[PDB]
């Protein structure tokens, strides 16, 4: 007798035991019984005028979209974070249209009001999308660096979310929509966006919530707006119980406690299936492990000295770096410093497609990490490198070379003609071990997983095989992709 | 050098309004003066312009309603990092 979507984000072993949520959307019906007295209408309003040739103010329900979303986040009976406190800003007109420039002015208003109210956690819900905007993504990043949790809709266009903003801003939590069968929502002939800029999915079809028709009325709605509102509710409950969760910690926990592999990825275009996280959001038991996430770069492009680069959040360490090419014409990957922070750069061959760089990004408190490299050796034992300093643990191995004529504890081994790069980290109680799995007849992929209690930090293929497309981590499983091949996982934990 | 940016989705473009983003560390009084200098340069060429907003706090710069004819002029202003043409966002 409770809405399917509220049940869906509530995990099996759920135990129900200061945060401001800002909503940038249409006007809202603040009198509605779901939100009465818990949502305050700020005086912020910056919207373009309606298209008057189609606008009949007498008939229009200007409050319908925002009221429903406020109810999904914090409604008394049907909300995710019931009774949570909210502040609404109007950046969409009655016809659901706004501007990048008005949205920026709304984000600046949030920044101003953050410096005035007592310091505390704030969530900003952005249930809107336009085309990729450099300025809008930059404003979102600057707010994220001030400790704001930004949550946004992936977009409703059955398209790559990286073409939309603020969906494409990396530090914003980008939410796609799934239905009661945990499949991607279709909306008309389109539906939820997908791709490497989506962080997770959440219920976004047939979502019951406050209707501005009347103060006690309810209505079902569908879209990635509704899904983002679910994750903003989840964030608000997490931050209500742990007010000094950082955004980075919050994002890793959202990823970690989501339902895995419940989506049939055949819905997505083939070349987006590896880029799109198979995650449906759920409330983490939380209230408090080594958390890691995979970060795919953009495709490098068919220039054949072109590079792809994958980066971690500021609070995270880059523990390993791999690469992938759909036809295997790559020159490997390299961990390198850029402004005193360590990035993952993959290199293209010299004919054809392009490459992805794939970073493994982890929350490792009080860590001091570094990369150590060895030039190509030209020796039968190959190129070797290892973490010489005491208490420095090997978390990942990278390898890049120069031209494609390759064919004949705590250490990295690579081809004779390749440079080899070791990620080494010092952290209290960090311990790591290697697991391997080899298959003589590789049917496209060989995998190996870390046991429960361990976290996959590094994923790699054993060198000396011309039939390797690349390697990447999927949660705690190392995945090597072939056209005898061995997958090599590095698994770590903390005390 | 200062670059110009616009929405890739052509029907979502809103030409005639521009966000001028100034280099990082630019102070409010310099954004304020850069906006007034753009207005004065454009007025000398026969163009009316409107400063709609001067940003400070998130990013430094300003919002200007003006003819796209003036983009080349605006790109040569001191402190300019890049200029973005306004565009639409939509309820999802």
């Amino acid at each position: 007798s409770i809405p399917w979507n509220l049940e869906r984000i509530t995990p099996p072993r759920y135990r129900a035991d200061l945060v401001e949520v800002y909503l940038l959307d249409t006007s809202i019906q603040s009198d509605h019984r779901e939100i009465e007295g818990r949502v305050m209408v700020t005086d912020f309003e910056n919207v373009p005028e309606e298209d008057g040739t189609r606008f009949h103010r007498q008939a229009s329900k200007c409050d319908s979209h925002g009221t429903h979303l406020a109810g999904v986040v914090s409604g008394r009976d049907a909300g995710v974070a019931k009774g949570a406190s909210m502040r609404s800003l109007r950046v969409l007109n009655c016809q659901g249209k706004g501007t990048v420039s008005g949205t920026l002015i709304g984000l600046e208003f949030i920044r101003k009001s953050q410096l005035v109210q007592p310091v505390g956690p704030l969530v900003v819900l952005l249930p809107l999308a336009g085309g990729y905007s450099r300025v809008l993504n930059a404003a979102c990043q600057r707010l994220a660096r001030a400790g704001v949790v930004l949550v946004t809709a992936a977009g409703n266009f059955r398209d790559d979310a990286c073409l939309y903003s603020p969906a494409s801003a990396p530090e914003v939590i980008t939410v796609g929509a799934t239905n009661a069968q945990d499949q991607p929502v279709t909306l008309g002939t389109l539906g939820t966006n997908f791709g490497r800029c989506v962080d997770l999915f959440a219920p976004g079809e047939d979502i019951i919530g406050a209707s501005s028709d009347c103060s006690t009325c309810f209505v079902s709605q569908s879209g990635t707006s509704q899904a983002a509102a679910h994750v903003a509710g989840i964030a608000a409950m997490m931050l209500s119980a742990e007010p000094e969760l950082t955004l980075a910690e919050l994002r890793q926990r959202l990823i970690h406690f989501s339902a895995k592999d419940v989506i049939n990825e055949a819905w997505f275009p083939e070349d987006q299936r590896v880029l799109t996280p198979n995650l449906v959001a759920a409330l983490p038991p939380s209230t408090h492990q080594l958390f890691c996430r995979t970060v795919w770069s953009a495709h490098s492009g068919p220039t054949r000295m072109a590079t792809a680069i994958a980066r971690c959040a500021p609070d995270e360490e880059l523990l390993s770096c791999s690469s992938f090419s759909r036809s295997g014409k790559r020159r490997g990957e390299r961990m390198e410093a850029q402004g005193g922070k360590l990035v993952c750069r993959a290199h293209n061959a010299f004919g054809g497609e392009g490459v992805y760089a794939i970073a493994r990004c982890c929350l490792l408190p009080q860590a001091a990490c570094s990369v150590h490299t060895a030039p190509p050796a030209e020796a039968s034992m190959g190129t070797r490198v290892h973490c010489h300093q005491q208490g420095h643990v090997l978390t990942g191995c990278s390898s890049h070379w120069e031209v494609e004529d390759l064919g004949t504890p705590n250490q990295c081994v690579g081809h004779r003609e390749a440079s080899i790069h070791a990620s080494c980290c010092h952290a209290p109680g960090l311990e790591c071990k290697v697991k391997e799995h080899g298959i003589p007849a590789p049917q496209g992929q060989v995998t190996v997983a870390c046991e429960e209690g361990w976290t996959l930090t590094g994923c790699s293929a054993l060198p000396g095989t011309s039939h390797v497309l690349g390697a990447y981590a999927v949660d705690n499983t190392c995945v090597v992709r072939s056209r005898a091949v061995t997958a090599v996982a590095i698994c770590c934990r903390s005390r | 050098t200062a670059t110009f940016h616009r929405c890739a989705k052509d029907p979502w473009r809103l030409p005639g309004t521009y966000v001028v983003v100034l280099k990082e560390e630019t102070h409010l009084s310099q954004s304020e003066r850069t906006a007034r200098r753009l207005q004065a340069q454009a007025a000398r060429r026969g163009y009316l312009t409107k400063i709609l907003h001067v940003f400070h706090g998130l990013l430094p710069g300003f919002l200007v309603k003006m003819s796209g004819d003036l983009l080349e002029l605006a790109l040569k202003l001191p402190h300019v990092d890049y200029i973005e043409e306004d565009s639409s966002v939509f309820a999802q």
Partner: antibody, heavy 123, light 112 residues
Framework: EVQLVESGGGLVKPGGSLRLSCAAS????????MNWVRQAPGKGLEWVSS????????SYADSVKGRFTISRDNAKNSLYLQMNSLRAEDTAVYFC????????????????WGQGTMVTVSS | ESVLTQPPSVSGAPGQRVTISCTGS?????????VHWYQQLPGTAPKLLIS???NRPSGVPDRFSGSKSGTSASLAITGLQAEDEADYYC???????????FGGGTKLTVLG
């Protein structure tokens, strides 16, 4: 089973009035725009009127402007067409059809149609 | 007298390939709005056939394809079958009319 069922057709004299209705089931009606399309016997499809999910966009073919009024009631999962000052050339089958409301960001296909209700205007 | 122009009729024998054109103007197809196509079997409601210039709904065979270029669009049917005998309608939003207008329709006849 997504479904649209229009009703209210009949025979009417010129200058008369009729109210069509369209009942939706099996989908999230309040997130879809709705449309009337008509087809005179042996003729082509003619768009009549559209109304968005929150009624903030409403438009009309020129040929019916000022005589027809579209409205919807999301709580009753219903779409309406009030037709006044009917003329013989309004004789047609009237279909309702949905399109997901992208708030003018995209104009999608009419992906589900009803079966139509017949309207005859005759002296 | 429709805003989008289609040929009144087309025909082919089973197995042939036929095309149906749809030409508009700068206020609809030429303004960046997609073309959608509908098939109406005799005595039935229209059903969606191609959406967004070239996408096939579930249940529409890959014999049907669509494209769009400039102010014109085209529907192509390969491997013509008898059950393809029907009326075909293109559709597009027109910004000067504020509505999604229909072509005049094309009657497809299966010969032979």
């Amino acid at each position: 089973e997504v479904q649209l069922v229009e009703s209210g057709g009949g025979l009417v004299k010129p200058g008369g009035s009729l109210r069509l209705s369209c009942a939706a089931s099996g989908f999230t009606f309040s997130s879809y725009s709705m449309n009337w399309v008509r087809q005179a016997p042996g003729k082509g499809l003619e768009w009549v009127s559209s109304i968005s999910s929150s009624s903030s966009y409403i438009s009309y073919a020129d040929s019916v402007k000022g005589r027809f009024t579209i409205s919807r009631d999301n709580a009753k999962n219903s779409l309406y067409l009030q037709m006044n000052s009917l003329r013989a050339e309004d004789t047609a089958v009237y279909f309702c059809a949905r399109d997901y409301d992208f708030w003018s960001a995209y104009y999608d296909a009419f992906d589900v149609w009803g079966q139509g209700t017949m309207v005859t205007v005759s002296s | 007298e429709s805003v989008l122009t289609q040929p009144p009729s087309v025909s082919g024998a089973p197995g042939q390939r036929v095309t149906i054109s749809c030409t508009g103007s700068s206020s609809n197809i030429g303004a960046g709005y997609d073309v959608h196509w509908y098939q109406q079997l005799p005595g039935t409601a229209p059903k969606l056939l191609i959406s967004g210039n070239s996408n096939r709904p579930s249940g529409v065979p890959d014999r049907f394809s669509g494209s769009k270029s400039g102010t014109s669009a085209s529907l192509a049917i390969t491997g013509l079958q008898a059950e393809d005998e029907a009326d075909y309608y293109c559709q597009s939003y027109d910004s000067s009319l504020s509505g999604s207008v229909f072509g005049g329709g094309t009657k497809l006849t299966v010969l032979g």
